[PDB]
Write an enzyme that holds these catalytic residues in place. Sequence first.
Site, PDB file in Angstrom:
ATOM      1  CG  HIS B 233     -15.569 -24.249  31.849  1.00  0.00           C
ATOM      2  ND1 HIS B 233     -15.093 -23.003  32.213  1.00  0.00           N
ATOM      3  CD2 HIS B 233     -15.101 -24.478  30.599  1.00  0.00           C
ATOM      4  CE1 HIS B 233     -14.374 -22.499  31.227  1.00  0.00           C
ATOM      5  NE2 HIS B 233     -14.366 -23.372  30.227  1.00  0.00           N
ATOM      6  CG  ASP B 267      -9.357 -21.716  23.459  1.00  0.00           C
ATOM      7  OD1 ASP B 267      -9.126 -22.949  23.365  1.00  0.00           O
ATOM      8  OD2 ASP B 267     -10.219 -21.201  24.201  1.00  0.00           O
ATOM      9  CG  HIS B 268      -6.958 -23.035  26.488  1.00  0.00           C
ATOM     10  ND1 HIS B 268      -7.251 -24.383  26.387  1.00  0.00           N
ATOM     11  CD2 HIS B 268      -8.147 -22.398  26.616  1.00  0.00           C
ATOM     12  CE1 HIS B 268      -8.560 -24.552  26.468  1.00  0.00           C
ATOM     13  NE2 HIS B 268      -9.127 -23.362  26.588  1.00  0.00           N
ATOM     14  CE1 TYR B 334      -8.120 -17.415  24.987  1.00  0.00           C
ATOM     15  CE2 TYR B 334      -8.576 -17.453  27.337  1.00  0.00           C
ATOM     16  CZ  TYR B 334      -8.684 -18.030  26.087  1.00  0.00           C
ATOM     17  OH  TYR B 334      -9.352 -19.238  25.929  1.00  0.00           O
ATOM     18  CE1 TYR B 467      10.539 -22.589  10.224  1.00  0.00           C
ATOM     19  CE2 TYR B 467      11.535 -22.534  12.427  1.00  0.00           C
ATOM     20  CZ  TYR B 467      11.640 -22.433  11.047  1.00  0.00           C
ATOM     21  OH  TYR B 467      12.871 -22.156  10.505  1.00  0.00           O
TER      22      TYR B 467
END
EC number: 1.7.2.6
Lengths: 504, 504, 504, 64, 64, 64
Positions: B233, B267-268, B334, B467
């Site tokens: 970040h 998460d990404h 998200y 999958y």
Amino acid sequence: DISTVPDETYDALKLDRGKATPKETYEALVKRYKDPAHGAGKGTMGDYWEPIAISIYMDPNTFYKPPVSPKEVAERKDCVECHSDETPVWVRAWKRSTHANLDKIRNLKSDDPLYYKKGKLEEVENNLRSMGKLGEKETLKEVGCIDCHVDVNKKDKADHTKDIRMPTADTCGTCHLREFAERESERDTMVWPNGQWPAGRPSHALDYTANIETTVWAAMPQREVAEGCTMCHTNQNKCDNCHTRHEFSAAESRKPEACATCHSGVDHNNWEAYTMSKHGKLAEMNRDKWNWEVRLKDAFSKGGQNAPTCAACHMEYEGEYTHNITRKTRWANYPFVPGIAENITSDWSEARLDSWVLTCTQCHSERFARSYLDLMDKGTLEGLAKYQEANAIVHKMYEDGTLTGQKTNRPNPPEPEKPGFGIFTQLFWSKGNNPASLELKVLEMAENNLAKMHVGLAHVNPGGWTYTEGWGPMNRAYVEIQDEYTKMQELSALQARVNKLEGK
Amino acid sequence: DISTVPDETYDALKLDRGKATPKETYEALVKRYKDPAHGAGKGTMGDYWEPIAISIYMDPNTFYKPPVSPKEVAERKDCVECHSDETPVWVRAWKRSTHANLDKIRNLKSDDPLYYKKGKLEEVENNLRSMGKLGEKETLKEVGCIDCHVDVNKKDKADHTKDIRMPTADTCGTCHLREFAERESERDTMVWPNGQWPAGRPSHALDYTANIETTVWAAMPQREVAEGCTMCHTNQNKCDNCHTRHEFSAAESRKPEACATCHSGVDHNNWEAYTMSKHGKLAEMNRDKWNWEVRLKDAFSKGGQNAPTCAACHMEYEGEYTHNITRKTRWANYPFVPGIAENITSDWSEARLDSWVLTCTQCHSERFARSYLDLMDKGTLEGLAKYQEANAIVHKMYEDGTLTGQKTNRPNPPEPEKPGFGIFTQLFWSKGNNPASLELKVLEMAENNLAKMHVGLAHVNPGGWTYTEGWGPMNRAYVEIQDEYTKMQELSALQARVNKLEGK
Amino acid sequence: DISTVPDETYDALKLDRGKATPKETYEALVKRYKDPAHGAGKGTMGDYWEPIAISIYMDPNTFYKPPVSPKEVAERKDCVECHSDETPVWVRAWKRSTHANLDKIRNLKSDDPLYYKKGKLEEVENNLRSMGKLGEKETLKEVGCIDCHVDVNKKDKADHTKDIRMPTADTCGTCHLREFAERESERDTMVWPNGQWPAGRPSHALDYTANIETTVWAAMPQREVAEGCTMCHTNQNKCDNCHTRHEFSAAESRKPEACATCHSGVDHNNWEAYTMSKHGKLAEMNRDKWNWEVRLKDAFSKGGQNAPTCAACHMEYEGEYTHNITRKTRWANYPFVPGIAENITSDWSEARLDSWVLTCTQCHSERFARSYLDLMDKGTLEGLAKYQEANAIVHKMYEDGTLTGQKTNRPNPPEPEKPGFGIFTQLFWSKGNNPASLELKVLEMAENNLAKMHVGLAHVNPGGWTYTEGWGPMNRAYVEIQDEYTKMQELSALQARVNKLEGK
Amino acid sequence: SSLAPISAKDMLDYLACKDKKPTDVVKSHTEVENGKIVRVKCGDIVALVQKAREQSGDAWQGGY
Amino acid sequence: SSLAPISAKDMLDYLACKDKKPTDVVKSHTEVENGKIVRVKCGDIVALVQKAREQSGDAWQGGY
Amino acid sequence: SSLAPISAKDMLDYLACKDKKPTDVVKSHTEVENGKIVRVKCGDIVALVQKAREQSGDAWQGGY
Ligand code: HEC
Ligand code: HEC
Ligand code: HEC
Ligand code: HEC
Ligand code: HEC
Ligand code: HEC
Ligand code: HEC
Ligand code: HEC
């Protein structure tokens, strides 16, 4: 003298650096290398396991016998002729390898970045001359099939059914005494202050010994599964896992990919962490600008390399590069091992940290490199603390006898393993409720997630110790451990109330 | 005026685009950039956390002071000469960088595909002259250590203990005003119609602000874990995460690998989805045939590039390329963020979809691209629907007070976090049964698996939303949520029966 | 005759390979290819699902209609000119492809390694002449947009709204009859001894059929999720998934990356296992030393290839290479499929093992290869044994009706699916407690972890059957299955004690 | 011989108290109680570690 | 300001009803009841979505 | 037609008994009982597999 071999090795071999000839150094290395007391052979649990078919290639010195067919007697030239369609690519790759082109090595000019290889050739020749394998005025013509697989500089016929060997580390070391000696020196330079790991370990010199001394590896019935372990643990026996047969390219062993088949996965994701780090992504992006043929010593200058690689970081020690990869090891991957965390502030660890700082500061400032290595150390401890809290919960249940199935369906692991709580055996063997789920969970919390957390910190992959590996997965393990603990408490309370009612 | 900077930025800065000079534009940009009211400094939770050693490199404007040692007064050549020994790879990388070879840029010929860099150097010089840092007829001789780390075009001595700085985005923006301004324009173009995210976010311009304004990041005690977040970040604070120090190669920053260290993970997983798509596999297969040195504008013609890359898709906007990556964002990773799914049929989102269609139709037909972007949107909503059903179950348990340990072992998160159901803090902090396992599972089902489902859809990796990521993992979460929900209802029924029996 | 097409195919087409013309062979191939009874069209469950927008590209023969706009009547060069603006990268890629450079192919000299392409061009022309698309003295001038997308060798104008097609396998096969017939022959060479899989499966020839005959694919409402599956299953319909449009480069299709978008993921991680193996890591390290432009037959000689790749291993058969990838298949990825394990010792499987030994011994000795393949087979069975023990436990719960929610909250799957235990549908559809957690867990133990264990063994990735995939994850599933099983027994014993108390 | 064990949280608190007075108070790196990061008095952790080093004896060959 | 929430399943049925008549019946993209995909009457979901958009007021500035 | 099922552990034991006498004893590849790898008598596993091969009939076209 071999400048890159530590004094501790000449001492262990009872040799005088100044006087010991190549042949004497080699024989002393080989004697220790082949000594069962020092890790050779089947090890202490040999009675529990037998080799499978591929084991003849994984530990040739113990298991290999040449094929009973073909029944052939062959000279040097016959190997290539028959194998040119029997094993075509071995011949093709050998033919273009340095081993098949020693004259190109002799003709290297002193300004060529590859010139060092001419010196290595002459040192091999000097070794062979000391060992009586090469006349004093005889040039080494080639390193062909018959040299590695039968005898170095063999002049006559070989019986395919009796004389074929698989070349082991001591076979390569006949010529490559320096590299073999550097590798073997891992036995002598990797003494933990408090025996955190056995002397000489972890190391490539003892990786196979470490494998066959693992109880579940000896004990488990699924030998083909167990032999997957062996395939990551053959450096001790054979020298072709980084620079593979039959090209034997030093340029190949310098590439991170050379380490990746072994140094990857759920309990040490070095490949994954390094390649995702900026270092590794730079290495991916810049791989075709680099001259991988220059030696590690020249990588940052003559090779144009500008991002660090596994070899460049781990084979470096105090400005030199050798095959010994142990001398800056501090954490040794598994942060929970008793005495490892407590030792991280010792003078011994601080001196290895100083060595690491010397590696990083070929590029970064010392202030930067130290600020990150401090992050690495504290981050690893922060992970260890989270695991220790979770472990204390599950360990207490084990000691209290309240793990699921603990007293009703927890059969003993296969001999010679001893029953215990959260033991490595329970990652490769399970039966009934041995282990219990909570127990496996907290064992994997340390063995996989805490380990990968540390690997991610150590290799500068931020997702690899926060969201994706390390903290996140350890968080889930903690949460699930605490959740099942609470459910198991509430269930025990309910059972206690039903016990009261059966008392009235 | 900067042709590639949107009107919204000039309006946000109270500047007239027809009158503003590079100097006035730079000062207004930097004034906002350094304003703590607009995201600079320690942010609103600075009282809860303190920098650690590496924080001085992550947020130099807030934390960096030059080293107390060495005590050196140094001129421009002294930087290079002494660091040739202190940090040799930095000097080597700098020396072969464009920054150190401006005369080669001056002499580029109009037929050279890199000719545009001559124009760019003249714009830098125009910028510096407007700023009074360069004489109107004085050529910029180099960009050396002393320029970035002390002062641009510094002519005399620098005190190593007082005058050294870490170059932050505004340092580079002194010369690279266009790129800096384009980047800063993300503050002004990323306005969600309903504040689905804070204005200017998600963006690289505010990534560090977003980080330090995350409660758990400020509140958790494991600061070394938290700084892992920080390392992903830092674009706000420094411009070297895509084109890294010290080579600062734009060819490097055009490669997908440049984005991968940050744009990856649980998460990404954009790196993982893109590289597995045909797009990314083609980029892997053809990377050696492309000329990565041409600007993105020329990538598909002069560059030979025939598959899309992160930068070519995300920096493209209406046929131009800028450092602003926000203007086509619709889902923002998200899909469960309140208002995002509802906004996806708005004119606002449709206009950005039209912009995406323009990007895809450099290659595909519009009918093809639209058929896929339709699948992307609908497939994301189908994953969202699955999460919403699972979340309704667990959220009702929370409201009923029936999550494991909810009333008996749910300690409060660290200040200033407030207790709540399924909050982001529970991914990086846990204690006792805060969170509960079901709560974390449903949270991760949205945060990890639904996000990755969308990423896999957006980046055309079919396994990544069926999958392997997305649907399969979300299926498992739903199954386990439903299973635990039924087990918990059956346990409540059994406890009610035992309670009735105790009522005698 | 097409010598590389098996006799089984000419027998199945009722053709005499000695006498059939290209036109006859093509027509017989295509009649079968387009016959719904042989897998064409929407399949047996076409009433349960409808195409979405992208389906017109996935199955063009069933669904593609030309676009209603633009209203253009175009000649051959009109396509190129207009699309130089509408789809510019397609034109650029097409222009530099072999298809647009046939005169280059004609002028290849017999000493060029690519000389085989001239013969292929001349065979294509012969095919087209037999079919009456090309004059007996007419050369094929190019393969242009109008050729694939309207009609091969079209000389007049095309109505964009009536005549555009998406080129399917039979379109390419008009010219590339050999490759199309080799591909289609998979229908005929993949006959399992005991019908373990349906005839001609698994294969590329029937991958789309296999997709649409999957009940949950037809039955689930999440069409955009289901079409993710279709994107991996389009080889049957279109020929551009390995050598992609619009470059159609054989060199691209020979690279392992070409297979990876499909042959990856949680139930078949071939890409991940292969790339982590030494084979794949060598392929990564050496890719820029290999000439990927030589045909597979020449890869290891003229191409310099010294490590194996997907295409080289799987298209090789008895020393030749064809597009048929089925003839050495023994395990077919999923070890638990009824009859597959039992068939592994049959003469049929041993003969395919012999064929595999021929592949491996391009490099390894037969003794080496056979010892590893023996490890592969037995390692797979060891995984299967572990699964079978776990499955027996959960299946018994199913037969006893004690799976969580089995009798209270197990809604039926969508039509035309039939309810059952541990069925593939439960991986893509779940509602309430259908499936139960333990049921999903043991199904995923087989479908995911046992499959990936086998893939890791087949592709020589040690970690991929021991720690990281396969054994480790299966160990955990077994542990949690036994753990939940014990917990469920303990809970029902407690319930019985309560039930006894309620009897007063 | 073996080191007396020192938990990771104590190692962290010990590292936080390097070059701190015994009266100095630092934050835990690992512990939250009652909604607040635990605070640690440096003299307590220094004492805790020093008594572990005494039970380690010659096993501890020096260091911080 | 803030948009009135609309579930994903409703957004999907809304999109399924694009350019359909109110009396057209479409399949749910998400819901299975009694072994069959739920059918949705387009007029109904449009009514559902429009009443949410009415609650959004000026927060909804146009779109499908 | 279909092969009569044979468990993986029995296939393993059968392979382990390849070219062994019916009286020879081999270790199981999968079964641990009472802390020891189970020992299998090759005569028993061969009988077990042959009776599955008898039940298979023409389904088994030959092989080990
Ligand atoms: C003498 C009969 C040799 C034996 C046995 C082995 N090697 Fe060798 N090798 C030998 C020479 C004279 C040279 C050239 C000098 C040099 O060291 O460069 C080599 C070269 C290598 C290399 C580098 C090749 C290159 O990349 O240019 C490697 C990596 C290497 N050798 C490895 C190796 C291994 C693993 C051996 C045992 C299986 C082995 N060598 C045996 C001479 C001889
Ligand atoms: C420097 C920029 C590195 C490169 C590139 C690679 N590694 Fe590394 N490694 C590095 C550090 C600072 C550490 C921790 C050192 C410590 O304090 O103990 C490690 C650790 C390892 C280990 C454990 C041994 C150890 O020294 O602790 C292994 C086995 C390891 N690393 C392997 C490895 C691999 C396979 C790499 C390429 C994919 C790699 N390292 C690169 C520093 C650096
Ligand atoms: C020695 C005679 C120096 C000359 C002249 C200059 N630098 Fe230096 N620098 C030197 C050392 C030994 C160090 C290490 C400091 C540490 O403890 O790490 C540095 C450090 C830097 C840094 C990094 C600062 C940081 O916080 O990490 C920078 C950016 C730097 N030096 C720049 C720099 C410039 C611009 C110089 C000419 C004005 C210069 N250095 C001269 C040694 C010497
Ligand atoms: C003036 C003193 C500069 C400062 C401060 C920085 N840059 Fe620079 N850079 C400058 C010029 C005149 C040029 C050549 C023209 C051009 O734009 O190419 C560059 C070049 C770059 C590049 C491209 C280099 C290449 O790929 O060939 C990049 C990516 C770049 N510069 C980035 C950059 C960064 C990140 C800076 C702060 C750390 C920075 N520049 C400062 C002039 C000046
Ligand atoms: C403009 C004057 C055109 C000429 C002449 C040709 N094409 Fe075209 N084509 C054109 C446009 C604007 C589009 C986009 C339509 C859309 O809505 O996407 C297309 C599209 C195609 C396609 C894709 C069709 C699909 O369903 O995706 C193909 C295969 C195609 N065009 C082929 C093609 C051929 C073979 C032509 C010469 C006979 C030709 N085009 C001419 C514009 C124009
Ligand atoms: C005749 C009108 C053709 C049609 C329709 C298609 N192809 Fe083609 N292709 C054709 C020729 C005459 C050649 C040169 C001979 C050869 O086989 O090389 C080719 C070449 C290819 C290649 C190889 C390109 C290279 O690597 O040099 C590929 C991979 C290929 N063709 C594939 C292909 C596909 C997938 C088609 C349907 C979409 C197709 N061709 C149609 C002639 C013709
Ligand atoms: C030889 C060194 C191989 C290479 C390179 C690749 N594969 Fe492979 N594959 C190989 C073997 C020996 C087997 C098992 C064969 C058996 O059934 O006994 C496989 C298996 C597969 C399968 C299943 C089909 C089958 O033959 O059983 C697939 C779909 C597959 N492999 C794909 C695949 C991919 C995608 C590869 C590159 C990423 C790849 N293989 C390389 C041998 C070899
Ligand atoms: C045929 C007339 C041969 C000549 C002469 C040589 N080799 Fe050979 N070799 C041959 C065969 C057919 C095989 C395969 C045996 C099998 O069952 O796979 C081999 C094998 C080897 C091996 C592998 C040994 C192993 O256990 O896997 C090696 C290392 C080897 N051969 C080396 C070798 C040498 C050094 C030769 C000259 C002295 C030589 N071979 C000659 C066939 C023939």
